[PDB]
Enzyme design. Structure first.
Site, PDB file in Angstrom:
ATOM      1  N   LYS A  13       0.801  -1.242   0.000  1.00 16.80           N
ATOM      2  CA  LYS A  13       0.000   0.000   0.000  1.00 16.80           C
ATOM      3  C   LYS A  13       0.825   1.278   0.000  1.00 16.80           C
ATOM      4  O   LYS A  13       0.277   2.319  -0.388  1.00 16.80           O
ATOM      5  CB  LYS A  13      -1.099  -0.065   1.055  1.00 16.80           C
ATOM      6  CG  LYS A  13      -2.105  -1.191   0.971  1.00 16.80           C
ATOM      7  CD  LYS A  13      -2.956  -1.253  -0.287  1.00 16.80           C
ATOM      8  CE  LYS A  13      -3.458  -2.660  -0.519  1.00 16.80           C
ATOM      9  NZ  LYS A  13      -4.927  -2.629  -0.745  1.00 16.80           N
ATOM     10  N   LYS A  73       0.907   5.140  -4.874  1.00 12.95           N
ATOM     11  CA  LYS A  73       1.515   3.853  -5.192  1.00 12.95           C
ATOM     12  C   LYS A  73       2.211   3.946  -6.550  1.00 12.95           C
ATOM     13  O   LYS A  73       3.322   3.416  -6.712  1.00 12.95           O
ATOM     14  CB  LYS A  73       0.497   2.723  -5.208  1.00 12.95           C
ATOM     15  CG  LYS A  73      -0.371   2.479  -3.983  1.00 12.95           C
ATOM     16  CD  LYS A  73      -1.567   1.624  -4.371  1.00 12.95           C
ATOM     17  CE  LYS A  73      -2.545   1.297  -3.266  1.00 12.95           C
ATOM     18  NZ  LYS A  73      -3.640   2.288  -3.162  1.00 12.95           N
ATOM     19  N   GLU A 164      -5.933  -2.402 -10.692  1.00 10.89           N
ATOM     20  CA  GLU A 164      -7.013  -2.317 -11.656  1.00 10.89           C
ATOM     21  C   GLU A 164      -7.733  -0.943 -11.524  1.00 10.89           C
ATOM     22  O   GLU A 164      -8.408  -0.471 -12.463  1.00 10.89           O
ATOM     23  CB  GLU A 164      -8.134  -3.348 -11.442  1.00 10.89           C
ATOM     24  CG  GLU A 164      -7.925  -4.613 -12.274  1.00 10.89           C
ATOM     25  CD  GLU A 164      -8.856  -5.760 -12.046  1.00 10.89           C
ATOM     26  OE1 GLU A 164      -9.761  -5.740 -11.148  1.00 10.89           O
ATOM     27  OE2 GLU A 164      -8.663  -6.771 -12.816  1.00 10.89           O
TER      28      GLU A 164
END
Ligand code: FMN
Ligand code: FMN
Lengths: 216, 216
Positions: A13, A73, A164
Site C-alpha cells: 500500500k 503507489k 485495476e
C-alpha cells in the site's frame, strides 16, 4: 522455497521513495515479462516500464477521479509496469511469432514450421472468426503474465501491488496506445514498501481449501 | 534464482506415467492455488484436483474431437488441475470473503470490515451491474492464478502444461459445474516429463525486448 514466497508476498500500500531497483533488478523484471507463457506462444502484449519521474507522473495521471487512492503507489514506487493487451489478433502478429520461433531454432524442417503456423492460425481463428472473442482471449493471456510477474518479483525479494483502479482511457490516450494497437489493463508499481504500508504487517486471508478445492 | 526457473520451465508435451508427486508436493500445489492474489480478494474460483485414474479419465473426456492431441497429457500426468471461474458474482460470495477476512484478523476496527465490504461491493457492482462483464472480470482473475501456478510449480522442480484445447461444455457437464455456479477455463496437468518430451530440449522462443517493452 516458493511456497514461503507465496505466503509472504503482499499488495503494497505504500512505497519507500528512496529505494530503487538496481540495474540488475531492472533487467530481471523485464526478463519475467518477456518469458511468461501464453496460449499458442501468441504473446499479444506490450509493456510500458516507467522508472523516470517524468514517466511515472504520466502513468500516474490515470489515477484520476475515484482512483486517487492509487496515485501515490504509482509515484513512489521505483519502476511502474503497465500491462497492455493487443486490441485484435492480426495475421502479421502470428507470422512475427512463427518467424521468431524459427529464428530461435524450434523447427527442424519447413514442414515443422508450416505445421506450427497452421495450428496457431486455427486456434486464433476459433476466437477471431467463430467465437468473436479474440480481445477477451488476448486480455486473459496478459492477466496470466500478471500472475507470473507478481510471484517472480516476490521471489526476487521486491514489493509490488497489482492495480485495476486506474482510468484505462486516460492511460491509453497519454501513451497513444490505440494508434499502436494496444490497450492498458493492469498497472504494477514495483519497489520496496515503507513504514506507512499498513498491509505489510496484516495477516493474509484466503478462503479455506474445503470451499475452493474438490479432490478426485 | 527465479529468473533461472523462468528460462528453464517449458510446456510439457509428454509425461512419465510412473512418476508421481509426493504427498508434500500435492499439498504444496493446493497452497499455490489458494494463495494467489485476485482483484479485491474476490477469489472467484474453484479447483478440481484429480490424481486418481478414474478422476483423470473423467477430465480427459473433454480432450475430444479436434482436442484429441491433449488427451495423453491429461492421462499420464500425476495430478490434473481444472481451473474454474464463477459464472456470476453474488452477494453471498462477497460476504463469505469479508467474514473470512474478519476471522483472519484483518480488521482490528469493526467499522473497517463494513467500510471494506461496500468498497468491494462497489467495485464488484461496476462489473456485474454497470459494465456487465462480471464473467470476464472473474475469468481474468483465474488466468492470473494460472500464471502464478505455472511459475510456482516450475520453482518446485515439477513439470506442467497449461491446456486451453479441451471442450469446456463436456468438462462442465461431467463434473456438474454449471449447477454449482462454476465453469472450467484451463486444465493443467502436473507431474514429470517423459524422456520422449521433445519440447524439453527445444530452445525457448520469445519476441525481443525491443518489440515488447517501451521504457519511459
Ligand atoms: C487484478 C488485481 C487488481 C488489483 N487492484 C488493486 C487496486 O487497484 N488497488 C489496490 O490497492 N490493490 C489492488 N489489488 C490488490 C488485491 O486487493 C489483493 O491482491 C488481494 O486483497 C489479496 O491480497 P494480497 O495481494 O496481499 O495477497 C489488486 C489485485 C489484483 C490481483
Ligand atoms: C493459456 C494457455 C493455453 C495453452 N494451451 C495449450 C494446449 O491446449 N496444448 C498445448 O500443448 N500447450 C498449450 N499451451 C502451451 C503454449 O504453447 C506454450 O505455453 C507456449 O508455446 C510457450 O512455451 P513455454 O510454455 O514452453 O514457455 C498453452 C499455454 C497457455 C498459457
Amino acid at each position: 522455497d516458493i511456497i514461503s514466497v507465496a505466503l509472504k508476498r503482499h499488495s503494497t500500500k505504500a512505497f519507500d521513495a528512496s529505494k530503487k531497483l538496481t540495474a540488475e533488478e531492472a533487467e530481471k523484471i523485464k526478463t519475467l515479462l518477456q518469458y511468461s507463457p501464453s496460449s499458442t506462444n501468441s504473446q499479444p502484449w506490450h509493456f510500458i516500464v516507467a522508472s523516470t519521474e517524468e514517466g511515472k507522473a504520466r502513468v500516474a495521471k490515470s489515477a484520476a477521479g475515484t482512483y486517487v487512492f492509487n496515485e501515490r503507489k504509482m509515484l513512489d514506487a521505483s519502476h511502474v509496469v503497465v500491462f497492455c493487451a493487443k486490441t485484435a489478433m492480426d495475421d502479421a502478429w502470428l507470422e512475427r511469432v512463427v518467424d521468431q520461433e524459427e529464428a530461435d531454432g524450434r523447427f527442424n524442417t519447413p514442414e515443422a514450421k508450416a505445421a506450427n503456423h497452421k495450428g496457431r492460425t486455427y486456434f486464433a481463428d476459433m476466437h477471431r472468426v467463430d467465437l468473436k472473442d479474440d480481445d477477451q482471449w488476448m486480455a486473459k493471456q496478459v492477466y496470466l503474465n500478471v500472475g507470473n510477474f507478481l510471484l517472480g518479483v516476490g521471489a526476487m525479494g521486491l514489493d509490488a501491488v497489482p492495480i485495476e483502479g486506474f482510468d484505462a482511457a486516460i492511460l491509453d490516450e497519454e501513451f497513444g496506445l490505440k494508434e499502436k494497437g494496444f490497450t492498458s489493463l493492469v498497472v504494477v508499481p514495483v519497489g520496496h514498501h515503507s513504514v506507512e504500508d499498513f498491509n505489510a504487517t496484516l495477516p493474509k486471508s484466503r478462503l479455506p481449501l474445503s470451499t475452493i478445492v474438490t479432490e478426485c
